[PDB]
Every structure is written in C-alpha cells, then in structure tokens.
Ligand binder design. Structure first.
Ligand SMILES: NC(=O)c1ccc[n+]([C@@H]2O[C@H](COP(=O)([O-])OP(=O)(O)OC[C@H]3O[C@@H](n4cnc5c(N)ncnc54)[C@H](O)[C@@H]3O)[C@@H](O)[C@H]2O)c1
Ligand SMILES: NC(=O)c1ccc[n+]([C@@H]2O[C@H](COP(=O)([O-])OP(=O)(O)OC[C@H]3O[C@@H](n4cnc5c(N)ncnc54)[C@H](O)[C@@H]3O)[C@@H](O)[C@H]2O)c1
Ligand SMILES: NC(=O)c1ccc[n+]([C@@H]2O[C@H](COP(=O)([O-])OP(=O)(O)OC[C@H]3O[C@@H](n4cnc5c(N)ncnc54)[C@H](O)[C@@H]3O)[C@@H](O)[C@H]2O)c1
Ligand SMILES: O=c1ccn([C@@H]2O[C@H](COP(=O)(O)OP(=O)(O)O[C@H]3O[C@H](CO)[C@@H](O)[C@H](O)[C@H]3O)[C@@H](O)[C@H]2O)c(=O)[nH]1
Ligand SMILES: O=c1ccn([C@@H]2O[C@H](COP(=O)(O)OP(=O)(O)O[C@H]3O[C@H](CO)[C@@H](O)[C@H](O)[C@H]3O)[C@@H](O)[C@H]2O)c(=O)[nH]1
Ligand SMILES: O=c1ccn([C@@H]2O[C@H](COP(=O)(O)OP(=O)(O)O[C@H]3O[C@H](CO)[C@@H](O)[C@H](O)[C@H]3O)[C@@H](O)[C@H]2O)c(=O)[nH]1
Ligand SMILES: [Cl-]
Ligand SMILES: [Cl-]
Ligand SMILES: [Cl-]
Lengths: 426, 460, 460
C-alpha cells in the first residue's frame, strides 16, 4: 500500500504546522513552508477529506467538571472525530492519533469503528513532541518520530504506510515503531520526565537558599555527568505551558484508576514541588515588603510562560500575580509579546482595582516597591536599572525568578537595589 | 603563585587509593602518600594482590609505587610533609541516635581534622573528598581555627569524587568533570587554583569546574539523587506498562531519544543497589528536614519509596504466581550482586527479594558467578539462613527441582543457559521471574518449552 | 545628656490619647502634641466631650489642653518639631491573603515610618507603642535607613502599653511597670535613657524596665497570652468540674491561694473576649509557624481552641437542655458586652453564643444595659438578623414568654432581678443558663421558684 491522500482533523497549534511540513488536506518559518505547498499538495469540507490517512489533532483539555475534575482528560472532542470519520469511510483508510491522550484511548476509537462497520479502518498512534517557540525546527529535524500500532499483520502494514510518509525527510533510524499503548504512554512519560527535571532542580534551589550553595553552580556540576545531561536544569519560579501539568496529572489519574497509588503519589510530587516553588516565591516577595503590600505598586516583568512567545497557559506569572492580588497589591504588568487583552482574561474569574497593564517596563517600575521578573525575556537583562532605581520607592527590591540578572548583582547592589533570586542565599 | 609538590591522602579505600594512584601516574614531579590506620589494608596495597579490584588499577600502581606513590601507616609524618591533604575516610550512615538511618556519621572526618591541625605547621590545603553533608567544611574550619598556631594557614576545599564501580580508572583518567569548591576570599581562590593545576596535568581546563564550597558538597549529593531518580522513574513506568499492555523497554527507548532527557540510566530493574544511592538520597532527605524544608524532603523521599515498592511488588508477584504459598518450595535465585560484573552486594535487590521469600519459608538456592558464598551468608543473617538458604555452585544445581527461577542480576551468562535442560528437572508448572529484562527476545522459546515467564514492565 | 522636650504622638485613639494626656499632666515642661488623620476625632478631643470615655480622663485633658497638651491634624509640623515621636496607630488582624485571621496588618505603621522619615531632620526618637509583631521595629529601621538624609539620625524604640478598659488613667498614673526596648548600642542606650527620663517624672525607677527591642515587642504579646491562658485553664477545669461534681469556684479559690499561682484571672466564664486577647495569641501562633516552631505554635493554639470549645459546649448545653430543638423558641440573652461596665462588644462571647442559637432558628431577645442596639445588629449580621433577633429595652420584656434565660455578661443588675416575676411569664419548664457564675448562692431560691438553673463549672 502507498499513502497518497492525507486528511488532518484539527488545524490548531499542532495540526497546522505538522501537516504543512501526497495530497494533504487540513511560528518562525511557518508562513514560508505553507506558501510553497498551498495549491499543489496542501477547508471546512471535513467529510469529503475523510472520504478521500486521517490525523486527529483536536484539543484534549483537562476536565474541569465531574469525576476526575482537574486531573482526567476530556475526550469528547476525540470521540466526535471518531464518529464523523466512520460515518464517511469505505475501504481502507488509516486513522492516526496525534493529540495527547490517555493510554488505551485508541481502544475506544477501535470500538467505535467496529460497532459501526460497513461491508477496513486501521488506528495508529503518532504523538507530537514539538516545543512551542521552536516548533518549525523540531518538525523539520525531530529527535524521533514515534508510531504505534497493533502487532497484527493488518496493523503492522498500517505502521509501514505511515513510516513511508515520514521517511521522505526523517532518517529511518529516527523513526521508532512500537505497539499502540507504548506509543500513547511514551508521550505522557516523556513530558513527565521533562517536568521532573525542572521540579528536581527547583527543589535543589530551595536547598541552595538555605545552605549558601548556588543552584546555577550545582546545575552545571550535575549537568556535566553525561548520564544526566545538561538540558532542562534551569531553575525557575515554576514551569508553565499547556501540557506539563496537564499530562502529569493525567498520568497520576491514570495510575489511581489502575490501582497504582504508589506510582500516582510518585509523580504527584512533580506538581506539588512546582506549586511549592511558586508559593514560596510569592511569600518571599510579601515577606521582604514588610509583610504588607496593600496599595503598593509592584512591577511584573514577563507574563508568558517562557520567552519568545505570547502563550500564557498555566504561566507562573498568573499564579504569582494572583498571590499578590490576594494581598491587595497594585500590579503593573509588562510583557513584550503577550496581548494585553489576554492578561486581563487570565487574571479574571478585582482586575480593575489592582491590575494595570503597562506599555513599557519603565512605566511599570515607576514608583514601585519591587520588580518581579517571571519570564526569561532577553530584554530584561539590558534595562537601565540606575534609571529605574531613581523613581522607585525605598527600599527598592528586585525579585529575579529566572536567573536572568546573574552577574549583575554587584552593580545592582551598588545602585541600591536589594536583589534576590531563586537558588541564591540572600 | 603556590605549587603543590607533596600530597597526603588520609584513607586508602575505594576512593583514596585509585584517585591518588591516578594523580601520581599523571604527575611525576609530585609525591603522593596514601595513609590509613588499617595495617592489613596498607600492606595489601604494597603486596601483589591489591585489596580492591579495579580493572587497570594493578598496572597503574606498579608504575608509580616507589617513584612518587607510596602506601604507609605513618599518618602523622605524611601530614607534616604534605602541601595538600585529602580527607578520604568513610562516612557511614548513622545506625544510632538522632538521625538514625539517614544522617551521616562524621566522627571519622572530625578525627582527621583533629589529627591534621595538630601535626601541621605553615601552609597546607585540606580537601574534602569523602561524601559529606552540606556545610561540613564549616565544621572543619571551626576545628582548625579553634586549635590554631602562629603562622598556621589551613585552607579547606571541597573536591568530591564521581567514579563508579568497575570503571574507576576509566573515570579517573577521563572524567566528565572535576569539581572543586572553595571560598570567594583571596586565600580561597589561591588554594582552589593550586588544586586546579594538579588536575590540569591530565584533565582539560574546560572540564574543571570551580564553585563555592557548599555548591561542591551539595552537587555530589544531588548528582547521585538525580541518577537514582531516573531509575525510580523508569521503574514507576514499568508498573504502568504491566497494567496497560505497554512495554517499558519500548517506552524507555522512546523517552531516551529526546536529547534533553538522554538515553542513559533508563533500564528498569527490580531496584537499584550500590553503597551510595540510597545513602545519599536519604542524607539529602535528612538535611532538608533539619533545614525546615519538608516539601523538598518528601519530594526526594519518593525516590526511595519507589525503589522499595519495586522490590516488594516483585516479591509479591513471585508469591502470588506460585499459588500464594512458597513455604518449603525450592526457588532458584540467579544473581546476588547489585549489578553485573562485580562481587559487591551492598544494598543489592537480591538481598531484599531473598529476605521476602525467606520470611515465607521458601528454600532458596542462590547462585552468583562472582560473589563469594560467605558474603551471601552474611547478608541474609541478622537460625533462618541454616534452614532455608543453600548456595549452589552453578545455575543448574540451583534450578534442579525448583518451582521458579528468579533472575535478579543482569549477568550475561543467564541469557545463555540451557532452558530445555532446566525445564525438565523443574517441578511443574515452572516459572521464570526476570527482574532485569535479560531474557528479552527469548519469551517465545521459553513459552514453547513450557515456562511461564514473567518480567518487569511487560504484561503477563 | 539629651533631654526630650517636645513629644508627638501619631494616633489619637484609645492608646495615644490617654497616654499622652498623662505624660502632659506629669511633665509640665514638655510639649505634647497628639495628631491624627481623623478630624472629627481630633475636634472631639478639643471639645468639652471626649471621643473615648475613661474615668478621670476628662479631668486630665481639661487640665492640660492648651498648656502643654494639644490635639491637631497638622501631622507634618508635629513630626518636624518633636524630639520624640510615638507611633500609636492601629494594627488590625489581616482579613485577607497570607496569614489571614492571624497576622497583623502593618500598613498603618509603615505609613507612619515613611511620613516620619520624610518630615524629619536631625535627631529624633521614634517609639513603637502599638501592638506590633516581633521584629517590626527592624522593618521601621529599614525604611529609615533606605531613605536617609544628611544629618538624619532616627532612633527606634519599643514602648508597649498595658492599660485595660475602665482603669486607663489609674494604670497610666500608677503602672505595674513601664517597658522600654531599644538596641544594645550606645546610640540605642542613649535613646532608651532619654525616654526613661520622661517616665521618671512620676514612675519609680525600679518600675521602668529596659530591654532589647525584640524582648519588648515579645513581652507585650506574651503578657496577654499568659492572661488568656489563665482563663482557658480555669475554663478547662470548669468542664472537669461539671463531669465530676467538683465546683470551679471552690477549685479556683483553692488554686488561687497558692501565692505562686495568684488569685487573679481565675474566674471561669463562657469565654474571654476583648480586642487583644484572641488577636495577640493568634499572632503569637502565626509568628511561631513562620519561625518553624510548630510545637510552640500548637502549645499556644490550645488557649484559643479551649476558648472556642468553652463557647460551643455552652451553646450545645442550651440546645440539649431544651429537648434538642430551639427552632422558633424565644430565648433571652442577658448581656452582650465582652465584660461588665462597658459597651464594648469586640469578640464578646455573647456574639458567638447568639450566632449558635441563631443557626438553630431560635428567637433571640437581647438585653444589655449599656451596649447600643445598633452595635448588636452589626455584630450579628454578615436576612437572618431581622427574623430571629429582637433587641429588648429591659430584661423583663426579653424574658416574657421565653424558654430560657442565657446570661453571658456579669452585669451586677442581673443578680438583682425579680425572678419570681420572670418565672411566672416564662414557658415551662423554664431554664437559666448562667455563663458567668453571677447567680451563685441563688440556686436554692431559683430552684424553689421552679427554674432549672445551670451554670459553668457546676454539675447539674
Ligand atoms: N506545544 C503544544 O501545544 C503541543 C505539542 C504536542 C502535543 N500537543 C497536544 O496536541 C493536542 C492539540 O492541542 P493544541 O494545543 O494544538 O490546541 P488547538 O488550538 O489545536 O485545539 C484543537 C482545535 O481543533 C479544532 N477542531 C477542528 N475540528 C474539530 C472537531 N471535530 N472537534 C473539536 N475540535 C475541532 C477546534 O477549533 C479546536 O480549537 C492537545 O492534546 C495537546 O496536548 C500540544
Ligand atoms: N563508589 C564509592 O564507593 C564512592 C564514590 C565516590 C565517593 N565516595 C565516598 O568517598 C568516601 C570514601 O569511601 P570508601 O569506599 O573509600 O571507604 P573505605 O571503607 O574504603 O574507607 C577509606 C579508608 O579510610 C580509613 N580511615 C578511616 N578513618 C581513618 C582515620 N581517622 N585515619 C586514617 N584512615 C582512616 C579506613 O580504615 C578505610 O580503609 C566515602 O564517604 C564515600 O561515600 C564513595
Ligand atoms: N486596650 C487597648 O485597646 C490596647 C491596649 C494596648 C495596646 N493596644 C494597641 O494599641 C494600638 C492602637 O489601638 P487603639 O485602640 O488606640 O486604636 P484606634 O483605632 O482607637 O486609634 C488609632 C488611631 O490612629 C489613627 N491613624 C491610623 N493610621 C494613621 C496614620 N497613618 N496617620 C495618622 N493617624 C493614623 C486612626 O485614625 C485612629 O484615630 C493597637 O495596635 C492595639 O492593639 C490596645
Ligand atoms: O530548564 C527548564 C526548561 C523549561 N522550563 C520551563 O518549563 C516550561 C515548559 O518549557 P518547554 O518545554 O520549552 O515548553 P513547551 O512548549 O510546553 O514544550 C513542552 O511541551 C510540549 C507539549 O507536550 C512537548 O511536545 C515538548 O516536548 C515539551 O518540551 C516553560 O514555562 C519553561 O520556562 C524551566 O523552568 N526550566
Ligand atoms: O538504568 C539503570 C542504571 C543503573 N541501575 C542500577 O543502579 C545501581 C547503581 O548503578 P551504578 O551507577 O553503576 O553504581 P555505582 O557503581 O555505585 O556508581 C554510582 O555510585 C557512585 C558512588 O557515589 C557514584 O560515584 C557514581 O557516579 C554512580 O554512578 C545498580 O544497582 C544498577 O543495577 C538500574 O537499575 N538501571
Ligand atoms: O478571670 C477572668 C478575667 C477576665 N475574663 C475575661 O477576659 C476578657 C478580657 O478582660 P480584661 O483583661 O479586663 O479586658 P481588656 O480591657 O481587654 O484588657 C486586657 O487587654 C489589654 C489589651 O487590649 C491589656 O493591655 C490588658 O492588660 C488586659 O487586661 C473579658 O472578656 C473578661 O470577661 C474572664 O473571663 N475571667
Ligand atoms: Cl556563608
Ligand atoms: Cl530522628
Ligand atoms: Cl491488548
């Protein structure tokens, strides 16, 4: 068999870029690749696209209701696709799961297809591993491509059909084929391992503040062991993004459902440590400002969950801001890329009384008691802090939640700042 | 401006011996004296049979023993003459009192500090090489300052060791990094830079990391904790794989191909062993509680709880598969060392799996190709060992008339055994419990032979 | 030898007013200016009717107001010319955020410190008189140092107040002790001695206690906690008495005759009230948690828990005695102030007893001979107050047709009521719940009348 026509249900943060990179019917450099394929081999006419490989790339948010609230994934969008696919299909076609789903979700899709059969739909798993802000580079040269299918003669042929698609630009040795369940579980486990590195280095940062060690020195020493590696060891106010907390909590929920309470509380610590890192950072700001920040002006420099993006989902800036808002602080928030309308939505259910969105950092720091850096934007390293200090109330504080001002502490102390950062004793 | 010409190392053990032997091999113009109180251990270093077995160690000592490397019992004289003093004594877990089973016993470290400052005059650099709790150098600096002399300048540095068992000479000659910690003071940097010059004889400068004293001490603890956390994490996944139909080896491969995660230390097992992983993680946990960091303490405690859970559930799997009773049943234990290609049994998972089965009254026949039988007898004691434990001479003796074969160590020979022969003389039904994934790919044959084979991270 | 000649006090409330009035009365050659942002309160000090009532206070102000005692709204000038600045502003319990219900809100203190260091030049002594958390003076010193000027020398002292309601003038003129805390430095000791000289005009030298700044702040909190602990301890005994047949009044007398224990503050009650006991104990508990002293925190938490338990069990006793339902029943609440001879109701046990009975749907008729009716409505509000709460203007109206009479405040008139008249118009059986032991000695006469009389610390 040879795949010649590909359909992708879901043109969002994932479905769009993946298919942009065979008649395929559905970030820096993304606008360039689409323009080279739109019209030759690259609509809302969903049924005909199905009726002529089908990628499922719809959202799977954490359930905010009912049983499993705040932990389980909501599969209602996935099932809607599966019903619509089997309605419009005859013959052979390959349905491929790309959304991040719980383990054994493909069994549900196969149940729907078999119960609505006609006088041959193969289900595969193909998770996504791109990271926001670097998606195009990750899609062009991925670390690995993961494809899962059943270990039957019918299933193994569907795997090879999808492998042939990726082999046009992915080396054969970078394409890993496993069973359906191992593929789904690997996506969840991969994100848990990444988040665990951040929570582990953040746990060390608390130890450093109490011992006089430095988390940047410790991370470097840890990272030079090639069995550990030097990636994802940057201590921070807490990891954000739309997938780390969601996938770990889903993993925890899956373990509780499968009667693995030891495994559930093992991975629960990744989330608990991240929450503790946020709460103690907020309490440090509040304590340094003499235990009261009512009507005090505080500058929030950085609102995105990481640099070089406008995404704010589960950003630590949201939680740090809400902690200070509960104390009645006057927040002046600047982010060079996050839309100002988004900041208002994130801090909403108080926003009118306490939250002001500044158009430049110097406006936000004018007359403020403290500067709180939550995002590692490169521009924060280059601000004129002697100018900022002149218009700040005294004493003036800088709370660096990202280690971006390292090496600048002596100058900032000479200017008159009390500078505090994560993983460094005050 | 200073140059270290004479080195003394207090402690001629697994660390002091090989580290100083390698330092002498790369530094011909520097005398290295390794001292110890143990008289028999010192003479064994000057014997043809070295007290510790390390591949390549015997040849390195013999090329320097006599030139610039020496072993001796004269601790006071070696300290008097040295420009650099290594503290490489043991720091065992306290088995008593406050912090029992978690905190480190610093009595040997303090004895060194007392003996050093007494037999010392002038300028000397004292370097912590043993695994010590964070801020232990502060205690050493207090002992030196409270027993000072005119024109006595003792500088304290931290220089932890990261060698592993079986590849120490390989690790010492080509380290991933050399870690040195000292003060920010002018005296501190000069002592740090003097020790850098020693390592620069064979370690590139980009691989020599200098930090403050506390970061150095904590990094040794944190490094071992991060490594053990990877094993417990992949072991937690192995439990998930067994309950979902996934395979932990396939999942580990998929995870490890992310270059931010890396593909090392993802081999699921019945549980990690060795003399330092559980010891350093628990010490980390104890330090956090003492510093009022309960969140950090219970975070790293999960690494130990997961390792313990992996062991217990494996023993429960054996008992449950054997019709919920193993009383008076013969069970073969293949592998007793905590890893392959060694005779070390410290904190080996085989000890705990055996004790679980011994508590049920099972008749264990234990075979290990490298571990001495007297060590196994000591490990399973506090009798019970006489009634239940038999140490076999080859795997076929241990499997003769047994209900199950339990593989706990990844010895390569276990993969190459005659299982048709073992199956014929085993009681039926015959079980294989693979706690190391060493029999992967052999499941079809073993099942065709008639075995019920069960392994970690694979649905039965 | 520095000499304090002009005193400014920021805060003309219950503390700042009387304390400065007494200082002016006893120190005729010292100018005393009490300032405040509330103009209606400042004018009330200058009017022939004071804002706060204390016996003998009206005579003190009228004897000084115009000579050396002044009440102005010009805060900046009073700070400018003062040698000593009292901070006597409110420090309420935080009702929001971290530490809600336990920590103190320091925003008013900080407002003073910033305004002082802006309107100050030269040498000035700044004195904490408000009840502040421990190390609050460290925060004031940071504001002063971070906003320093040339020739600006601000010294920070602690000087808490211990006056009680009803005896403020007596306590200020003849205090058990005057407590002054300052830094143990020559600059601090000089500032301490200058403030002692002011009090030395009428306080014996041995009654003026000088400590470090932190001991002074902590002593204010601990003193109130010790007093509240005596009440909770004797209240805990009252529960034991009810279950054993002992009498809490006999036990308290027997305990109190030990001169090491003393006979003060051993009067069992439905629970202590007032604006400072619960707030200072809870603040102490919060301080111990922030400093990682959980044993000390739960030790002092027991004072509050026992006070809450004494209240809840008294309410449950009323409900249980009334055949387990009080829905739509008329209940008379005699006494709403937190103690007799005052109209203050802050944290009054009557508030909590009333809310418990309101949650059951009882019809409360509340009488207090001094509390304004509008205050009672505010205290019992969040509706529920309109349906259930009636404010009577004499006790007999409140007891007319009621099932029970609940005495929560020890007003002397409640002992002198006509209980035969009350019994005739009460529903039967008629109950009296004495939460203050005010009807002691009347139990036989009340039982003969037909009442079921129940009181704290006496078996029924
Ligand atoms: N960095 C990342 O964002 C990323 C990377 C890897 C994996 N993932 C996973 O990939 C999935 C895609 O999420 P996303 O971030 O791209 O969100 P998204 O914005 O793409 O949301 C899915 C969108 O699909 C559209 N859609 C089209 N047809 C639909 C249908 N029939 N039913 C429902 N929706 C339909 C909807 O408009 C919806 O907003 C998630 O499960 C996510 O966890 C995300
Ligand atoms: N793989 C490893 O075992 C390894 C790896 C890195 C670091 N470390 C750490 O290095 C340290 C050294 O461990 P080891 O395995 O070499 O221990 P060891 O048991 O070999 O002890 C070292 C030697 O010190 C001697 N000694 C003790 N007190 C002495 C004193 N007062 N004077 C003279 N000699 C004295 C002992 O007799 C012993 O022979 C430990 O704290 C360990 O945690 C171990
Ligand atoms: N018996 C007692 O009530 C008593 C006994 C000892 C200690 N204390 C403590 O004394 C303190 C004051 O108690 P109080 O009952 O007198 O309070 P209060 O509310 O009666 O008086 C405080 C006064 O300060 C004024 N004020 C507040 N902030 C100001 C500012 N920035 N500038 C100028 N004026 C300002 C207010 O308007 C008010 O008139 C509290 O901390 C209390 O705990 C109380
Ligand atoms: O050393 C680090 C690395 C990251 N972070 C933070 O962790 C969060 C996640 O960062 P990153 O992983 O780059 O962002 P994502 O876009 O969420 O990418 C993750 O989530 C994707 C969706 O599941 C996966 O495909 C990717 O592999 C995985 O990296 C951000 O708030 C970062 O600031 C740290 O605090 N320290
Ligand atoms: O993927 C893996 C890797 C290791 N292990 C187990 O982990 C334990 C320890 O393995 P290893 O790291 O080789 O042991 P050691 O030889 O004691 O070395 C460790 O302990 C030393 C003592 O501190 C450190 O210096 C080294 O850096 C550190 O690797 C053994 O029981 C292994 O079976 C696994 O189960 N899975
Ligand atoms: O044996 C006793 C003594 C008192 N109380 C109760 O305790 C509370 C407090 O009474 P009291 O101490 O006289 O009232 P306050 O006017 O608040 O005075 C206290 O609170 C002040 C701070 O506000 C301190 O300065 C005083 O020293 C301290 O007595 C009231 O509800 C009393 O009914 C009892 O129940 N039993
Ligand atoms: Cl230090
Ligand atoms: Cl203990
Ligand atoms: Cl299956």
């Amino acid at each position: 068999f040879e795949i010649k026509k590909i359909c992708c249900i879901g043109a969002g943060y994932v479905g769009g870029p993946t298919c942009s990179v065979i008649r395929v019917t559905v970030e820096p450099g993304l606008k360039e690749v689409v323009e080279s394929c739109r019209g030759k081999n690259l609509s809302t006419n969903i049924d005909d696209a199905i009726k002529e490989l089908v990628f499922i790339s719809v959202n799977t948010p954490t359930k905010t209701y009912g049983m499993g609230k705040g932990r389980a994934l909501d599969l209602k969008y996935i099932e809607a696709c599966a019903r619509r696919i089997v309605q419009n299909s005859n013959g052979y076609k390959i349905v491929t799961e790309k959304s991040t789903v719980p383990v054994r979700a493909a069994e549900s899709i196969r149940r729907i297809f078999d119960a609505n059969t006609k006088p041959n739909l193969q289900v595969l798993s193909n998770p996504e591993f791109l990271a926001e802000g670097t998606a195009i580079k990750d899609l062009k040269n991925p670390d690995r491509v993961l494809i899962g299918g059943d270990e039957t003669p019918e299933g193994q042929r569907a795997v090879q059909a999808l492998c042939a698609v990726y082999e046009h630009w992915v080396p054969r040795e970078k394409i890993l084929t496993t069973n359906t369940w191992s593929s789904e579980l690997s996506k969840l486990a991969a994100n848990a391992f990444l988040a665990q590195r951040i929570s582990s280095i953040n746990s060390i940062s608390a130890l450093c503040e109490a011992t006089g060690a430095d988390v940047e020195e410790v991370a470097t020493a840890i990272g030079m062991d090639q069995r550990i590696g030097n990636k994802f060891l940057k201590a921070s106010v807490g990891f954000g993004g739309s997938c780390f907390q969601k996938d770990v909590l889903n993993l925890v929920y899956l373990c509780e459902a499968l009667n693995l309470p030891e495994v559930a509380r093992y991975w629960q610590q990744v989330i608990d440590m991240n929450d503790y890192q946020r709460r103690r950072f907020a309490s440090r700001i509040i304590d340094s400002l003499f235990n009261t920040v009512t009507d005090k002006k505080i500058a929030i420099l950085g609102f995105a969950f990481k640099k070089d993006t406008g995404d704010t989902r589960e950003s630590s800036s949201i939680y740090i801001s809400k902690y200070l808002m509960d104390e009645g602080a006057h927040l002046h928030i600047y982010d060079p890329k996050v839309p100002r309308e988004q900041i208002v939505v994130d801090l909403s259910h108080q926003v009118s009384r306490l939250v002001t969105i500044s158009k430049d950092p110097y406006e936000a720091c004018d007359g403020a008691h403290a500067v709180v850096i939550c995002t590692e934007w490169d521009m924060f390293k280059e601000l004129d802090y002697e100018r900022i200090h002149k218009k700040m109330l005294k004493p003036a504080f800088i709370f660096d939640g990202r280690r971006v001002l390292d090496g600048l502490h002596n100058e900032l102390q000479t200017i008159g700042f009390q500078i505090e950062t994560i993983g460094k004793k005050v």
